[PDB]
Paper text:
In order to limit ATP-hydrolysis dependent structural changes, we used ATPγS, a slowly hydrolysable analogue form of ATP. 3D classification of the MD-(ATPγS) data revealed three different structural states (state I-III) of the complex. Out of the three MD complexes, state III was resolved to the highest mean resolution of 3.1 Å, with DDK having a local resolution of 3.5 Å. We observed ATPγS in four Mcm subunit interfaces, with ADP present at the Mcm5/3 and Mcm3/7 interfaces. Within the active site, we detected ATPγS, a Mg2+ ion and a short peptide fragment positioned within the substrate-binding region. The peptide amino acid sequence was not resolved, but contains a bulky side chain at the P + 1 site, consistent with the DDK preference of an acidic or phosphorylated residue in that position. To our surprise, in the MD-(ATPγS) structure we observed an ATPγS molecule bound to the Oligonucleotide/Oligosaccharide-Binding (OB)-fold interface of Mcm2/6, a non-canonical nucleotide-binding site. Specifically, the MD ATPγS structure revealed that docking of DDK via the Mcm2-HBRCT-Dbf4 interaction surface on hexamer 1 directs Cdc7 kinase activity to Mcm4 of hexamer 2. The MD-(ATPγS) structure can readily explain how Cdc7 can reach the Mcm4 N-terminal extension and phosphorylate it, as the Mcm tail is in direct proximity to the kinase.
When Dbf4 is bound to Cdc7 the resulting complex is referred to as Dbf4-dependent Cdc7 kinase (DDK). In the G1 phase of the cell cycle, the helicase complex is loaded by ORC, Cdc6 and Cdt1 onto the origin DNA.
Author numbering:
A (entry chain D): 177 to 779, 789 to 853
B (entry chain 9): 529 to 538, 655 to 701
C (entry chain 5): 2 to 108, 131 to 214, 235 to 303, 317 to 340
D (entry chain F): 100 to 200, 259 to 430, 441 to 462, 497 to 838
E (entry chain G): 220 to 423
């Protein structure tokens, strides 16, 4: 009996149901739940899932269990526990923490394990439900949804410094120096009105010692909603998330995160002088789980968060920054990398629904892989970010290729050229409405750090806006010296720009540089300049028309209209593994081929600067990273040179004058 | 402190099961449950008793 | 142009352990004493309260020895802090009387007065030291003066002068004091109007009777060459016009203090708040 | 009343006393047992110092680490006990140091902590504990007096209660000295009869290498107290050791969450039948530093005196070298290949001339300003990259990412309703250093005029918002620019190639125009260097001098005052004549024409060359070298 | 009387307190926020739930319990807010504006504040031309204090019903009357040409 007032939750029944779920859950239950019974493999989907998780947490010393809420729907006894957890997260999560402690104690005692029970008993175990029902955006939540477990998805814009939240107030007597330690209770600390010592009973002798109190970490994070459903006429919304005591600093600006937390409302005092609250409550989210890994997205660049990864180890936050690759997945990755057509398979796996553009999708793949990041022991840095420009005739799917690389990249901001400003692409000063203070917010090029910034309409953006991209495309930094901000900000973001030539058509009469219409200093920064031309070829029309019209045969198309394309789930994992674990090293034969080719190109018309040698190297490295090779041979350099030449269509360009021979184009 | 009776809001065999480590409200549904059947069908769990069945015989 | 927001409560949970000294525990124990006390298999106090309600006698007469026989600790509380415990007993009587009256009307009343008497040992009027102050004392004597009844406000409506803010001041306790402990507010209470802006609406106010008696030690047991010692007493409501001068009485009261026996420093004038008068056989 | 004693506080004080007395160190083959801290106490006795430097490495060994835990973890609690122990040790050994020469205030300055924290590694578990952080100083307060031991006069009893310890906030006493008054709430602070400390509030940003991906730099307010004031100046990267404290922060109003609050306990209070006493317990994390070290030299002898002997060995060997100029040039920007004139110019800029003031105060400046222009991808920004990170007090910035208020000082306001302050600009964080401005052409005209105001007078005047300060910006400007159209026009003048305004262009001593050509051998060799620089990391870089000893040599050579001998004056005149004759010839068509500004450029370049050769006399060969370096900079049209 | 459409100008102070319909165009809609109506507190001493009604823009929270037990006792209990037990309302503050056909000659259209509460929220969006029926109610003055001459009151419309002149395509439901009309359109034949020629029929 004895349910909790205001809730359906009964401590005994909920504890029993959650314990039964923990002891007797296998992932085949969820596979049956998701109507995926033919994916059920007896080897790993028939082991108790949470028993193994509890054992791993006991062995590793961690304290946080990541509970998939939908799993509770798979189990019959916890079909109601799912609704209780969603409706009453506080009570249910407290009961779940207690149940986790009991479960681990039972695992140690009942199996008679050697593990000490002292440090288990004194440890506080926490549960992190994440995969709760995903719907209703954030603006469609009514006041009846207050104090409910909700799931938001969005982009991190800003994060306040670590705020101390007092948990224990330390008072001291001004007379006898006797101290009590009051505990906070629902945000209220009972200040003593008399010294509890029987010797002296001075009324106002007690004074709060701020620096000797006990404090905990609190952080407010500014998030932009990116809901699955967007009602007509509304604009993007910003909300404030609250992370507590282990989740502080786990989210950086520019991160795309799915956050599960309690939808809370607080009354805001109208003035700082009097105690009067406003009748209109302010809504926010108490974060209980953060998911920074998407199964259809590349992993974050580990070379940019090494300090953050190891700070995450000290913080014991247990936030999964990069997805887990199992032994079977690693074997599959190696088997696919051992294929003879690996390059063409990965190229056509990039945006399967865009028509054949083999070099554009091969350059995109190499940019996704990137070069090798070389840090100098004596001071210096080379970044393997590859900048690609897609200049071409209108209607060539340049924008669909930028939209895929924006969706597939871990971090990055999609800009439109004329809608961007020099200040907008870098750090700027804004005003917070909560604190009424002046704060710094990142720009598009800073939020894209560690990812790819997609810039559409690269020709339409002005000369002064384009000035900030020079330092990013060359040094991968932004050295800002403005009123209030004087520092160097890492901007290690590849630049994927799209543009059409002047007149909105590639006139063959004018040379390449006249059509592109970009200053030598910016056209050199692009590692791969693609000329995407819309030639009238009858078979090309025949096949592009079948491709486009096949997408309309079924209401929601499942695209398998190729020999074979890897799923984005496998493609992203392969690319992330290659980026993380493969660091190609240039060999001497590769060096000779590189020097050979650079001198060959170094012999109006588009120039060939020293930056082209540096695009070769990194491009070659990208190729060497694609095949999981730790060294670069001359084949990779030859492929990089061939890609560079074919991107600008040198096979149809007269060496003397930069005319494109329309009859020599190889659309195919 | 917040507990109130279930009159507000929301097969006599019941008890613990040392095999499955789960509490059941009904014996005839625990023995036919998934985990109990899996435990019973696994002869590795009943190994030391297997010494006795034929040690006496 | 909106109305007054209301404030209301409802019991949901057990709070902190009922503590014995809590005014609400004391009221509950007095209510249980009134409803459950039996003398010769008779609920004497319940029947007395009902009969008093029928005859429109809004008071209850209680023997303190019966209270000793029921609960000794709260008898200690009543006899040691009468000024703080007597209103609780009156509240208990009022609650029980409301229940009885409403249940009996089918085949409002003010706060009931506790007229408590006893037959315990009596302190002589010359034996009252300063240790009896603010305590229940039984003392015998003879009444030598009974003043005219004076009107004391038990519930008065007030209205601000430079406003029309209507308020009500209720005096259910502390009616026995030479001064007036509760006065009109010094501010408009509607939060400038000025100091003491309230006036009393006399046609909607309620008043009670008060009388000043003068007890004296009996002249038989007096020192030959000294003045007989007298003592001022104050009674209210149903304890007024009960005795006439010359009546030999037994007064149960609170030995209290008021400030007014001539040349002295920090000295005070003692008096008796009468809680019960026990007249003897006197002249008919 | 029996005052409650902190038993572990007394124990920590006793442990600190034995640490101060009995600690011994083994010298490196130069003596027997020496007591470090007794020697330090007698040292600060003789020199009347107030700060004692305690090494945490030394402290960790004592009490099997039990003194170490307690001091590092509960520093705010055990600090008074450490002060008492130090005072007792001074009272028994060297007892004359306890007086000001009322009472001497003692500063215990811990340093050499095992680990250094970042600004973003600061967490609320470590409040009131000893720890070390690092950060780049942006703003420093004027030293201000902070009430340390206040004196109070009571309105009833006009006596004087003194030594009222102000721990962290204004605190009136509780009991009067005279027993009759019995007053606690009414007091007056009399300022003369009070005692004060020195307080500076430093603002520190995160280091550029510590900012995470996509995040913005974090700022912290460090509080320097005692003798550590003015030890940090804007621009320097300093590490601080001290207490992580909390200060009231009323700006947390409106923030999400349940902000803590305090209410007076209303039980056991004896009501008779509105006393709120409600406060806001919102705080922000600040830092209180007891030790600052950075991570006036114009005199040569004082610089050589405080410098290790082996470094003297190598410095004098470098001076004894014959081609020291050529080796220095080859050691400048080793990653760049083949631009040797630019390396010469950078070395001379990093050395500099002498500042000379006339009788009436013309104040001739001896800072070499260099502009590097040329074709795309010619290593122009790889020389600016090299200068920042090697040259001390060097600030790198870009044209489009800078403003007039970011290069010169700005007038900013942290809090609405708060006063205004001067946060130091790029031209001041690089004071007595180099400001490397990349993409000078991209910069706006107004920003160029602002930089012009600093190139003419080496000073910046800001008269905005009620602050009328005149700041000095003694900086050399190394600028990188791109010609209009994105490519240098050989048949056009240097002025026609550059959109840079003439008032700016005049103050640049050297204009290095770098052009690339399709030379077979040069391209084969640049490409070998780029790929070897990619294959190897530092083995491909083979400089004659490492950055350490090169920086040491430059630091030594900056201490000279070069003088030119009598024949040098006449040859300077002759070389100026030769430059004027070369210009306006009729067919030379120089990129920029010659005037008396070139003659001043030549003098300061000769002084820089003399500093490079480490001689106080400017040989006429130095004037010849400066003349050649200047003349080769001009490009014929 | 309550349904004849009124302009923003035609809604004078005589109509205050009445149920009236205003015809206009919505120009600004705020986010649906929880506006507290009866804030609830729990007392740990007596175990009571004390409810305080909220009527104005701002309210002062209770500090000491006001239940029977604590009021009768001398040791009062300090009572904490209970958000889940409090009464909240989905609150929106829309702004309606005069249509161009309602503004007099040479005048600038004036706006009116609409207070949408309960399940009626999210029924008004900017750009909607709507007939909003609600109770015209007064509010405490919010202008400059020096300009207050008497008991001046701000006004708003407590929305009760919304009629959309142009029904949104997303809110379409195939009810019976919608069905009969569509069949009477289809059975007439030539739907494509009839619909095309019916678009601006005076354009030829
Ligand atoms: N090769 C292609 N593969 C797939 N869809 C294509 C292709 N070419 C054109 N399309 C389709 O036709 C449209 C044109 O593609 P877009 O992405 O608009 O081209 P674009 O190159 O961005 O055009 P500009 O240069 O910006 S006018 C899209 O809606 C595509 O679905
Ligand atoms: N009103 C002013 N007039 C002139 N210089 C000023 C003025 N205000 C600030 N400054 C400059 O700013 C420097 C910083 O010193 P302060 O202004 O005293 O400190 P601050 O950085 O404003 O710190 P706090 O927070 O006010 S203690 C001064 O040394 C001046 O150079
Ligand atoms: N002489 C050289 N020595 C070493 N690296 C060189 C040389 N010339 C060119 N490079 C390389 O070519 C690239 C030049 O990039 P930057 O140094 O930014 O050139 P830049 O002259 O600033 O170009 P702009 O003016 O910004 S288009 C880098 O990869 C350099 O390492
Ligand atoms: Mg497009
Ligand atoms: Mg450059
Ligand atoms: Zn005390
Ligand atoms: Zn079982
Ligand atoms: Zn009034
Ligand atoms: Zn005093
Ligand atoms: Zn209460």
């Amino acid at each position: 009996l004895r349910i909790i007032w205001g809730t359906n939750v009964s401590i005994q029944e909920c504890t029993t149901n959650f314990r039964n779920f923990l002891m007797s859950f296998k992932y085949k239950f969820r596979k049956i739940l998701d109507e995926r019974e033919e994916f059920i493999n007896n080897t790993t989907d028939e082991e108790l899932y949470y028993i193994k998780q509890l054992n791993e947490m006991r062995e590793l010393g961690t304290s946080n269990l990541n509970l998939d809420a939908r799993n509770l729907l798979a189990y019959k006894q916890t079909e109601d526990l799912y609704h209780q957890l969603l409706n009453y997260p506080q009570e249910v999560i407290s009961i779940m923490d207690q149940t986790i402690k009991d479960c681990m104690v039972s695992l140690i005692v009942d199996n008679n394990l050697d593990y000490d029970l002292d440090e288990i008993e004194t440890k506080f175990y926490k549960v992190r439900p994440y995969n709760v029902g995903s719907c209703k955006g954030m603006r469609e939540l009514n006041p009846n949804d207050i104090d409910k477990l909700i799931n938001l998805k969005g982009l991190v814009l800003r994060s306040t410094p670590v705020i101390p939240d007092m948990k224990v107030a330390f008072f001291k007597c001004n007379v006898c120096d006797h101290t009590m330690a009051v505990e906070i209770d629902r945000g209220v600390i009972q200040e003593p009105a008399r010294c509890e010592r029987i010797d002296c009973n001075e009324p106002n002798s007690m004074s709060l010692i701020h620096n000797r109190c006990s404090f905990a970490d609190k952080q407010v994070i500014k998030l932009q909603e990116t809901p699955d459903f967007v009602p007509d006429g509304q604009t993007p919304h910003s909300i404030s998330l609250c992370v507590y005591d282990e989740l502080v600093d786990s989210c950086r600006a520019g991160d795309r995160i799915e956050v599960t937390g309690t939808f809370r409302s607080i009354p805001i005092r109208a003035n700082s002088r009097q105690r009067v609250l406003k009748s209109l409550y302010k809504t926010y989210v108490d974060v209980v789980h953060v998911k920074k890994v998407s199964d259809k997205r590349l992993d974050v660049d580990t070379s940019t968060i090494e300090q953050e990864l190891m700070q995450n180890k000290v913080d014991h936050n247990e936030v999964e920054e990069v997805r887990q690759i199992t032994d079977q997945d690693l074997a599959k990755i190696r088997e696919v990398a051992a294929r003879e057509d690996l390059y063409s398979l990965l190229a056509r796996s990039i945006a399967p629904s865009i028509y054949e553009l083999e070099d554009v999708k091969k350059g995109i793949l190499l940019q996704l892989f990137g070069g090798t990041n070389k840090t100098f022991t004596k001071g210096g840095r080379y970044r393997g970010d590859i900048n690609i420009l897609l200049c071409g005739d209108p209607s060539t799917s340049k924008s669909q290729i930028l939209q895929y690389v924006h969706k597939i990249t871990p971090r990055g901001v999609y800009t439109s050229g004329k809608g961007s400003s020099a200040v907008g692409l870098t750090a700027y000063i804004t005003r917070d409405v909560d604190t009424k203070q002046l704060v710094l917010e990142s720009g598009a090029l800073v939020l894209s750090d560690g990812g790819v910034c997609c810039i559409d309409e690269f020709d339409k953006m002005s000369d002064s806006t384009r000035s900030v991209l020079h330092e990013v495309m060359e040094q991968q930094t932004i050295s800002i010296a403005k009123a209030g901000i004087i520092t160097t900000l890492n901007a290690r973001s590849s630049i994927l720009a799209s543009a059409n030539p002047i007149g909105s058509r590639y006139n063959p009469n004018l040379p390449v540089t006249e059509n592109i219409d970009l200053p030598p200093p910016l056209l050199s920064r692009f590692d791969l300049v693609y000329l995407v031309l819309d030639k009238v070829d009858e078979k090309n029309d025949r096949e592009l028309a079948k491709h486009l019209t096949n997408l309309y045969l079924e209401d929601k198309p499942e695209h398998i209209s190729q020999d074979d394309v890897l799923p984005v789930e496998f493609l992203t994992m392969y690319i992330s593994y290659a980026k993380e674990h493969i660091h190609p090293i240039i060999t001497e034969a590769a060096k000779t081929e590189l020097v050979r080719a650079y001198v060959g190109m170094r012999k109006k018309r588009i120039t060939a600067t020293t930056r082209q040698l540096e695009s070769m190297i990194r491009l070659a490295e990208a190729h060497a990273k694609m095949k999981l090779k730790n060294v670069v041979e001359l084949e990779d350099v030859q492929e990089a040179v061939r890609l560079i030449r074919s991107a600008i269509k040198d096979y149809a360009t007269d060496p003397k004058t930069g005319k494109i021979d329309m009859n020599l184009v190889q659309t195919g | 402190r917040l507990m109130v009776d279930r009159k507000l809001g929301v097969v006599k065999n019941s008890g613990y099961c040392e095999n499955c480590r789960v509490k059941y409200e009904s014996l005839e549904q625990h023995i036919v449950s998934e985990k109990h059947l899996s435990f019973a069908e696994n002869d590795l769990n009943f190994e030391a008793i297997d010494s006795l069945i034929e040690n006496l015989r | 142009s909106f109305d007054r927001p209301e404030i209301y409560s409802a019991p949901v949970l057990q709070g902190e352990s009922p503590n014995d000294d809590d005014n609400t525990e004391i009221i509950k124990s007095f209510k249980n004493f009134i409803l459950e006390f039996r003398l010769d298999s008779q609920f004497i106090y319940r029947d007395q309260l009902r009969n008093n309600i029928l005859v429109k006698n809004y008071s209850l007469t209680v023997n303190m020895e019966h209270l000793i026989g029921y609960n000794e600790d709260i008898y200690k509380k009543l006899s040691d802090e009468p000024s703080d415990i007597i209103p609780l007993f009156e509240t208990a009587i009022t609650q029980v009387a409301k229940r009885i009256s409403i249940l009996s009307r089918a085949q409002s009343l003010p706060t009931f007065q506790l007229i408590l008497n006893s037959n315990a040992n009596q302190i002589p009027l010359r034996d009252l030291d300063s240790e009896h102050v603010s305590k229940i004392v039984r003392l015998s004597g003879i009444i030598i003066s009974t003043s005219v009844l004076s009107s004391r406000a038990t519930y008065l409506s007030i209205m601000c002068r430079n406003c029309r803010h209507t308020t009500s001041i209720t005096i259910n306790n502390f009616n026995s004091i030479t001064g007036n402990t509760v006065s009109l507010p010094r501010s408009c209470l509607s939060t400038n109007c000025g100091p003491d802006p309230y006036i009393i609406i006399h046609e909607s106010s309620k008043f009670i009777d008060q009388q000043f008696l003068k007890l004296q030690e009996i002249p038989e047991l007096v020192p030959v060459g000294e003045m007989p010692r007298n003592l001022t007493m104050t009674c209210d409501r149903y304890l007024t016009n009960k005795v006439i001068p010359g009546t030999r009485v037994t007064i149960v009261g609170i030995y209290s203090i008021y400030n007014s026996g001539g040349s002295g420093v920090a000295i005070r004038t003692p008096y008796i708040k009468i809680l019960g008068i026990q007249s003897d056989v006197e002249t008919s | 009343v029996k005052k409650v004693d902190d038993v572990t506080g007394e124990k920590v004080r006793e442990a600190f006393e034995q640490f101060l007395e009995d600690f011994s160190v083994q010298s490196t083959d130069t003596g027997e047992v020496e007591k470090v801290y007794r020697a330090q106490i007698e040292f600060m006795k003789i020199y009347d110092l107030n700060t004692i430097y305690i090494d945490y490495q030394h402290l960790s060994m004592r009490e099997n680490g039990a003194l170490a835990m307690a001091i590092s973890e509960q520093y705010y609690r055990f600090l008074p006990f450490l002060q008492k122990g130090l005072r007792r040790v001074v009272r028994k050994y060297a007892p004359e140091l306890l007086n000001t020469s009322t009472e001497r205030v003692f500063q215990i300055s811990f340093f050499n902590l095992p680990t250094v924290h970042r600004i973003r590694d600061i967490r609320s578990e470590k409040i009131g504990s000893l720890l070390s952080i690092s950060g780049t100083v942006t703003r420093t307060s004027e030293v201000r007096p902070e009430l340390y031991k206040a004196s109070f006069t009571c309105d009833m009893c006009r006596a004087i209660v003194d030594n009222v310890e102000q721990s962290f906030k204004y605190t009136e006493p509780t009991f009067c000295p005279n027993p009759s008054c019995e007053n606690r709430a009414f007091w007056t602070l009399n300022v003369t009869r009070s005692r004060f400390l020195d307080w500076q509030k430093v603002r520190i940003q995160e280091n550029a290498n510590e900012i995470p991906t996509g995040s913005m730099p974090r700022t912290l307010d460090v509080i320097l107290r005692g003798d550590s004031v003015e030890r940090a100046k804007p621009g320097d990267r300093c590490k601080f050791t001290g207490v992580e404290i909390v200060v009231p922060d009323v700006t947390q109003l409106g923030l999400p969450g349940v902000k803590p609050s305090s209410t007076l306990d209303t039980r056991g209070i004896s009501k008779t039948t509105r006393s709120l006493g409600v406060r806001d317990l919102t705080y922000k994390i600040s830092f209180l530093a007891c030790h600052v070290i950075s991570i006036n030299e114009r005199d040569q002898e004082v610089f050589l005196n405080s410098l290790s002997s082996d470094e003297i060995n190598e410095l004098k060997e470098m001076v004894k070298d014959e081609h020291i100029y050529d080796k220095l040039v080859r050691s400048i920007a080793p990653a760049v290949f083949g631009h040797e004139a630019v390396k010469k110019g950078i070395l001379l800029q990093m050395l500099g001339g002498v500042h000379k003031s006339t009788v009436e105060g013309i104040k001739l400046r001896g800072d070499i300003n260099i502009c590097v222009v040329g074709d795309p991808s010619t290593s122009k920004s790889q020389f600016l990259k090299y200068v920042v990170g090697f040259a001390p007090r060097s600030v790198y910035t870009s044209g489009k990412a800078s403003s007039a208020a970011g290069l010169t000082a700005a007038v900013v306001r942290d809090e609405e309703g708060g006063d205004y302050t001067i946060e130091a600009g790029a031209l001041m964080l690089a004071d007595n250093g180099i400001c490397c401005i990349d993409e000078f052409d991209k910069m706006d005209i107004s920003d160029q005029v602002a930089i012009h105001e600093a190139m003419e007078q080496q000073t910046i005047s800001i008269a905005k918002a009620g602050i009328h300060a005149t700041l000095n910006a003694r900086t050399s400007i190394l600028a990188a620019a791109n010609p209009v159209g994105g490519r240098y026009n050989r048949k056009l003048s240097l002025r026609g190639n550059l959109n840079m305004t003439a008032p700016i262009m005049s103050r640049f001593d050297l204009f290095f125009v770098i052009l690339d050509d399709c030379n077979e051998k040069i391209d084969t060799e640049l490409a070998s260097h780029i790929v070897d620089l990619h294959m190897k990391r530092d083995e491909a870089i083979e400089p004659p001098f490492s950055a350490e000893q090169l920086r040491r040599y430059i630091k030594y050579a900056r201490t000279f005052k070069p003088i030119l001998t009598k024949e040098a004056r006449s040859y300077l005149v002759e070389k100026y004549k030769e430059l004027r004759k070369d210009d306006a010839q009729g067919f030379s068509r120089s990129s920029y024409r010659i005037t008396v500004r070139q003659l001043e450029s030549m003098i300061r370049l000769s002084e820089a060359i003399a500093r490079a050769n480490c001689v106080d006399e400017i040989t006429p060969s130095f004037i010849a070298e400066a003349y050649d370096l200047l003349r080769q900079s001009i490009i014929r049209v | 009387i309550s349904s004849k459409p009124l302009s923003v100008r035609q809604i004078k102070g005589d109509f205050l307190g009445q149920l009236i319909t205003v015809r206009g165009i919505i120009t600004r809609v705020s986010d649906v926020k929880p506006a507290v109506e009866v804030i609830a507190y729990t007392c740990d001493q007596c175990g009571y739930e004390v409810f305080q009604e909220v009527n104005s823009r701002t309210f002062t929270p209770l500090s000491e319990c006001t239940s029977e037990e604590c009021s009768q006792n001398q040791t009062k209990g300090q009572l904490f807010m209970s958000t889940r037990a409090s009464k909240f309302s989905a609150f929106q503050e829309c702004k309606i504006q005069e249509l161009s056909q309602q503004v007099p000659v040479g005048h600038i259209p004036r706006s009116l504040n609409i207070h949408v509460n309960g399940t009626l929220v999210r029924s008004l969006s900017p750009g909607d031309i709507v007939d909003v029926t609600g109770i015209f109610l007064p509010a405490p003055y919010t202008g400059f204090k020096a300009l207050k001459a008497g008991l001046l009151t701000e006004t708003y419309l407590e929305a009760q019903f919304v009629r959309q002149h142009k029904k949104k395509f997303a809110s379409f439901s195939l009810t019976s009357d919608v069905e009969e009309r569509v069949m009477e359109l289809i059975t007439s034949g030539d739907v494509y040409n009839r619909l095309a020629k019916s678009i601006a029929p005076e354009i030829y």
